């Protein structure tokens, strides 16, 4: 069982299953995949859609007529399979010209070029029916302190995003932007390193309602942060526009393992959250099948992303519906957490002697939270051990 | 030389020099310090002022008349020395009642009590002339996923801060709030873990203009983040209300080493930033003299905080005034980073063929950034090796 | 089900269930437990035995006659319950005198005292029937570079351990030593920081056969290392004398969560390893019930340590016995990994043209490892999803 | 000043200055360098020598006669400049055939091929006068638990190294082996992850006297470990055969920054150690000029490696020769650390009542270590602030 269907909204970047396995120390282990073949193979596995960078679809430097051809063939594949394109993004990191950034390159002519390369792809994304346009600032940052005045760079980043906003507004496009944060790699430190930094920056843009976040499991974990806590803050702010799902083993290089790999418990708490909150965006996998694998291992890895999400969804649902868990949640006062501290208001609080002057602090101190009992029930549900 | 004076605005918490050296594995190595003796000793060393938690100054559970006495003696010490009190904070972490939090405890009665304990200390802080009231949510978080619904907790945290805002506004107090972020310890994961998360949360409060950040060097480093980059984002947002200075060796327990210890280069880039931006708040040291030390080592450690700031300030000033550095900054196009990408506007950009259609991408790609030359000049200035 | 019995060899330190919840920022949340009550409560839950520091059992500074009394009462409890004492250790970290170390304190008189405090407890451990005597050098290290010449310190550490060896040999005691590594906390950096450093140091002792390791899950993880890989190296060397089981969420302060918490997958791979290798030592839990909990949560947390080990053992056994997994292991060439590279010997290898001159490198390159298929089978077994 | 000469023994890999700037997300930013041009350019800057992988010097798949040609041209360059070749190594990581390892690949035919490729390069290294042959097991490890039985792999790694030993012994070559540890990247976890793990493994080889370590600054730091402490353990064991010098900012991807970048204080403590211990091997830089840089930045970056070592050497010498520092070292009892704990022997210790029964523990406890005073003197020396 645990058979995905298009209704689950599982999507994959072309660059994921298409990763040839070139890493910093080694050559490609797999041949290039034709975009058309990935769309067919992914449709068969039960995915809902694909996502793309401009350069994954249209070889860099293609003439207009080659461009048209490449798009026509891809569109035929989407029509043949029923696959959608809910998101797209720009490659502002591969070509040498972007070595010091796109939107925040020190060189003004490069920043202009980055904006133009981006706008041309927004038009194509809208034509293909994308609802979300992602920006990953992978080259925006520094290896040394004097190379990048961060205040000026944030001025340039605000400027670029406000211009993009102006463009989509003037063209009457129904697309929104999502920033994908990452703390480092390939630059020593990348600007807007976490979901929090991205959420704070968005509030200073001219039209903040057009921008949200595309957080990635492995990225927040590269800073040692709790990914479900970070997603909860994004949901609370109304800014979870998209999500990247994958696996990461702690603080090191960006692994991009299949979803469910890495920190398994954090994966369970994430699915519990997404499903309880009613998140209805795409479930996108930004992952790389390891370079050990041949083409059969590529499709197995991708199928496993989807499988692990669906097993985790069933176990989270079972945990929340268990009457014994419901009672534990009450024993730990989760119900009280949800009630206002002082709906009576500030003067009532100040006059309330049971809040301070006659508050028995030692009796309140003695009450156990019963969190460990709750957590082991959650453990037993994850592992299928409530038999 | 490098002799601090009160004009440098160096401040210290009472709990810093007063730390008795109790750690998770060992007993106190030093006897308690009387608050009056710390104010005298710090004045002699050249500090500008002190900061305090309610409980550092007034033993928990003191009667009103003991409270009055304790305050009177401390005030006499401030008058005798000329020492100021620019910041104060509440202890919402030591007493067992706060084991699941203050403002976000699951138990509503504890959340009420935390608000009342906080307000009573705001009144005292204003009486002593504090301009900034810090909140460190050290118990707000979780060790397990099911213990804390983060959305509800952020509702409770917003509620507490909005109430505090209402209180100071209604009393006509000229005080502002600053949140001190920390990613973990003593809870497994703490809410609002970084400067970015804190900045994003503040934008959802009812009166955001009353709240900013009190970032700490060692805390951001506990997440592997670049502290000067984080301070630059806070300065850009207009939210650097206060700062905690100290040292930390990478990702591990919160060390609170003396300033200049830990990551020395990040300390240089921070001072360069604070001084170039014109930061005029207090230079506060939230540090712990190591428990190896006796009282003579306590005062040496504190004096060193101040010394290292002043050596770093001289070296940063020398770096920025060096004509050879000025020319390197131009060679690396720092001047261009500061100029608008597209002050000509969006239609001009789109019509500009030198931005895309006739942009020579290979020639732009070939230009070296000259960052390594710049960085080694910065190295030579730090080390005093431009002789 | 998953009911522990004494035959499973689950042991707990007295200091684990006895932890009063004092952390660096807060007071105790639970009252002290009498050692006799912990032995009774642990026996009821199904544990095999307990472990102790000298100071957990005999209050520091007790007279000889109080000492005798304390031991007599504890022995009565062991007799009443059938509980064993397979391991013991010395507290060389709590008292202020050990602030710069025990065996590697700069002060020679303290190093002498540490050796004497240790020997007195070895005698008691043997009397109680301990087979393993653990040393955790928690104060051996430094916060600054000039404080500790590491070569000299390693001379002092070798000296202490060689003396201990001489003592047990001269008394004809059948006890061996195990070093518990930890990379940091409470010192900034601790000497012999990982299992590897400890294994290398043991080879330079005069009688290396008397010493091995007591690795802890959470400690190796505080350095970002793979704990099952580390245990495999220890097993390969014949030095896994004991093990500490618990949970840790990545690189931060030492959490000491219940076993199975933290990195769940690493917990599965560890149990798979221990059980396949035939490890027959104690399964000891060095954990701290979180300070949120009352006494009911303390016993629930301890029971969960044991439960999670037994669920993990069942899932690992099922994975290894599955014929489909056996065939996957062959598809990935695990069988070939176990066969000698060159049992034919060096001259045969050099003359073998199929090894170099006629080796088809491109055909070897093309073969997929099929690791992702294998790993998802392992995922399905862990989660109980091979239905 | 701070002008390197060949007598300082600064060496560089061909792959360092030759790095074309291809990273996991981007194409090359610099053209290939001819090995002959790097030898000339490095000689001019004051280096002593170069190091090479087989594949840096002889393009993979070259015929015997092309091989001979490539070697002849390189030898002419070494003769023309006076440059030496003190170390060499094998590329067992780039070609796709090594995707699951060399010596520990699951496939036996690949393990044979790795041994043959290695031996052919040992012959060439000896011909060029290398004294040290380095092995970096960058592909030896795993991304998932079931892919690699670590016990069997350590059997295969021991087997490979014992064969290499047998080869050099039978050929009467005066070369020794050094293992370069790294904890992860490009595999999720790499076998023998730290200096400690490598030192422990060497003690189980048949001729351990032929093998030592080549620790790298940035690698140990990728595990959060103190590099000078690790080098001290290697020196204590007599196994520091070579060293890789570079810079790294904490726990993340392997940066390979120029030496002196990254953790500056750890760089000072390392130079202090190397120079005080009389380390007389090569000072090798395993670094990558950042891909931001053109060829002028490549040579500036390399020159800076050498400059920072020489500034650090002068400051460390000044610290150790300062009579005020000498007295501080005594105040902190560094002299006592170097004296035997119990040269009187075990029975004398046990009979000595001043070691236990009459030891005044509270008076010993009260003595301050004076470490913070010492550390600030070390700070003032580093920064050139003892004027
Ligand atoms: Ca990623
Ligand atoms: Ca701190
Ligand atoms: Ca621990
Ligand atoms: Ca490296």
- Take residue B264 and report the two structure tokens written for it: 């020395």
Find, among D383, D305, D369, the residue nearest to D332 by Cα: D369
Report helix, strand or coil for C129: coil
Q: What is the C-alpha to C-alpha distance for residues A11 and A13, in angstroms, rounded to an integer?
A: 7
C-beta of residue A151 within 8 angstroms of C-beta of residue B236: yes
Which candidate in D368, D374, D381 is best for mutational testing of the B interface (most B CBs within 10 A)? D368
Breaks in chain D after residues (C–N exceeding 2.5 Å): none
Which of helix, strand or coil describes residue A255?
coil
Whether D56 is a known active-site residue: answer: yes
Closest ligand relative to D284 C-alpha: 4
Beta strands in C43-183 (DSSP E): 49-53, 87-89, 132-135, 141-142, 176-179
Task: Give residue A284's region: left, alpha or beta (phi > 0; psi -120 to 50).
Answer: beta
Give the C-alpha separation, D181 to D190, whole Å. Answer: 9
d(CA A333, CA C227): 36
Method used experimentally? X-ray
Q: Answer yes or no: are the C-beta atoms of A205 and B126 closer than 8 Å.
A: no
Q: How far apart are CA D136 and CA B48, in angstroms?
A: 54
- Is C115–D237 a contact, with Cβ atoms under 8 angstroms apart? no
CATH for C1-387, among 3.50.30.10, 3.30.360.10, 3.20.20.150, 3.40.30.10? 3.20.20.150
Protein residues near ligand 2, an ion, with CB under 5 A: B 218, 254, 256
Nearest CB partner across the interface for D152, out of C191, C223, C337? C337
Exposed/middle/buried for B219, CB within 10 Å: 0-12, 13-18, 19+?
buried
Please tell me whether residue C53 adopts helix, strand or coil conformation. strand
End-to-end CA distance of chain A: 19
Backbone φ and ψ of D135, nearest 5°: -120, 120
Q: Which helix (H) or strand (E) holds B220?
A: helix B217-221
Long-range contacts of D322-331 (CB under 8 A, 24+ apart): D322/D377, D322/D381, D322/D386, D324/D377, D325/D374, D325/D377, D325/D378, D325/D381, D328/D370, D328/D373, D328/D374, D328/D377, D329/C146, D329/D374, D331/D370, D331/D373, D331/D374
- Backbone torsions φ then ψ of C300, nearest 5 degrees: -65, -45
Nearest to B192 by CA among A276, A371, A277, A197: A197
Strand partners, D10: D283
Least CB–CB distance from C93: residue in B22, B25, B147: B25
Number of Cβ within a 10 Å radius of residue A119: 19
B189 contacts in C (CB within 8 Å)?
Answer: 249
Three-class SS state of A53: strand
CA distance B63 to chain A (A): 11
Backbone angles phi, psi at B51, to 5 degrees: -130, 160
Q: Which helix (H) or strand (E) holds B300?
A: helix B295-321
Cα distance between residue B128 and residue B123, in whole Å: 9
Beta strands in chain C (DSSP E): 10-13, 49-53, 87-89, 132-135, 141-142, 176-179, 189-190, 211-213, 244-245, 283-285
Task: For chain A, give every domain's residue range.
Answer: 1-387
* Three-state DSSP state, B57: helix
CA closest to C311 among chain A residues? A385
Q: Which residues pair with B23 in a beta bridge?
A: B26
Cis-peptide into A186, omega within 30 deg = yes
Distance CA C59, CA D17 (A): 63
**Which stretches of chain A are DSSP H helices?**
14-17, 35-45, 54-57, 64-81, 108-128, 150-171, 195-202, 217-221, 227-236, 264-277, 295-321, 323-331, 334-337, 346-351, 361-366, 371-383
| Number of neighbours of residue D195 by Cβ within 10 angstroms | 32
D113 vs C364: CB contact, 8 Å cut-off?
A: yes
**Among C334, C264, B40, which Cα is nearest to D146's?**
C334
| Contact between C145 and D235 using a beta-carbon 8 Å cutoff | no
Question: Contact A37/A50 with Cβ under 8 angstroms?
Answer: no
Among candidates D149, D195, D232 on the partner chain, residue whose Cβ is nearest the Cβ of C337: D149
Mutate to test the interface with C, among B56, B249, B290 (most CBs of C within 10 A): B290
Q: List strands edge to edge, sheet with B211-213.
A: B211-213, B176-179, B132-135, B87-89, B49-53, B10-13, B283-285, B244-245
Is there a contact between C227 and C190 (Cβ–Cβ < 8 Å)? no
A180 CA to middle of ligand 1, Å?
10
Nearest CA in chain A to D143: A290
Is B27 labeled as catalytic in the residue annotation? no
Distance CA B366, CA A27 (A): 24
Q: Of B124, B141, B146, which is closest to residue B133 (Cα–Cα)? A: B124
| Per-residue tokens: D200 | 């422990």
Contact A250 C224 (CB under 8 A): yes
**Closest Cβ–Cβ partner in B147, B159, B371 for A332:** B147
Q: Are strands A132-135 and A141-142 parallel, antiparallel or unpaired?
A: unpaired
Resolution of the experimentally solved model in angstroms: 2.0
Please tell me the distance between residue C185's alpha carbon and the centre of ligand 3 in angstroms. Answer: 9
Buried b (16+ CB within 10 A) or exposed e, B158-178: bbbbbbbbebbeeeeeebbbb
For residue A172, the distance in angstroms to the closest alpha carbon of chain B comes to 15
**Which of C102, A284, D378, A27 minimizes the C-alpha distance to B304?**
D378
Q: What is the nearest CA distance from D12 to chain A, expressed in angstroms?
A: 18
D294, B366 contact by CB (below 8 A)? yes
Cβ distance of A196 and B196 shorter than 8 Å: yes
Query: Residue B266 corresponds to which tokens in the numbers above?
Result: 């990040």
Cβ atoms < 10 Å from Cβ of D146: 20
Here the tokens at position D267 are 């760089």
Question: Tokens representing D69?
Answer: 């040609």
CB pairs under 8 A between B and D: 126
Q: CB neighbours of B68 closer than 8 A, spacing ≥ 6?
A: none
What SS3 state is found at B132?
Answer: strand
The CA-based dihedral angle spanning residues C284, C285, C286, C289, taken in that order and rounded to the nearest 10 degrees: -160
Q: Which residue has the tokens 């809910």?
A: A86
Q: Which residues pair with B244 in a beta bridge?
A: B216, B284
Cβ-contact D76, D122 below 8 angstroms: no
End-to-end CA distance of chain C: 19
Distance CA A199, CA A239 (A): 8
The residue among B235, C275, C361, B308 whose CA lies nearest residue D95 is: C361
User: Is the torsion defined by CA of D163, D169, D173, D177 positive or negative?
Assistant: positive
């Amino acid at each position: 069982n645990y058979q995905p269907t298009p209704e689950d909204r599982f999507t994959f970047g072309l660059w994921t299953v298409g990763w040839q396995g070139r890493d910093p120390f080694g050559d490609a282990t797999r041949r290039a995949l034709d975009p058309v073949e990935s769309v067919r193979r992914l449709a068969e596995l039960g995915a809902h859609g694909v996502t793309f960078h401009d350069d994954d679809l249209i070889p860099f430097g293609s003439s207009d007529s080659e461009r048209e051809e490449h798009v026509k063939r891809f569109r035929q594949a989407l029509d043949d399979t029923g696959m959608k394109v809910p998101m797209a993004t720009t490659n502002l990191f591969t070509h040498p010209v972007f070595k010091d950034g796109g939107f925040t390159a020190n060189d003004r002519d490069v920043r202009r070029y980055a904006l133009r390369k981006t706008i041309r792809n927004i038009d194509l994304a809208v034509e293909l029916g994308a609802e979300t346009y992602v920006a990953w600032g992978g080259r925006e940052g520094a290896e040394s302190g004097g190379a990048k005045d961060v205040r000026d760079a944030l001025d340039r980043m605000k400027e670029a995003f406000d211009l993009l906003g102006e463009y989509v507004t003037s063209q009457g496009y129904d697309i929104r932007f999502a920033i994908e944060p990452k703390p480092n790699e390939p630059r020593g430190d990348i600007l807007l390193p976490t979901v929090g930094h991205a959420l704070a920056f968005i509030e200073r843009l001219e039209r903040p309602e057009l921008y949200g976040v595309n957080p990635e499991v492995g990225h927040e974990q590269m800073a040692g942060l709790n990914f479900p806590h970070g997603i909860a803050q994004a949901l609370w702010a109304g800014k979870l526009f998209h999500i990247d799902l994958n696996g990461q083993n702690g603080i090191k290089y960006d692994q991009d393992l299949r979803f469910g790999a890495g920190d398994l418990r954090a994966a369970f708490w994430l699915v519990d959250l997404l499903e309880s909150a009613g998140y209805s965006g795409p479930r996108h996998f930004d992952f790389k099948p390891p370079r050990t694998e041949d083409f059969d291992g590529v499709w197995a890895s991708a199928a496993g992303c989807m499988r692990n999400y669906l097993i985790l969804k069933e176990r989270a649902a079972a945990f929340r519906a268990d009457p014994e868990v419901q009672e534990a949640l009450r024993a730990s006062r989760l119900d009280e957490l949800a009630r206002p501290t002082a709906a009576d208001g500030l003067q009532a609080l100040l006059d309330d002697r049971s809040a301070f002057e006659e508050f028995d602090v030692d009796a309140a101190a003695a009450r156990g939270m019963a969190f460990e009992r709750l957590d082991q029930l959650a453990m037993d549900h994850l592992l299928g051990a409530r038999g």
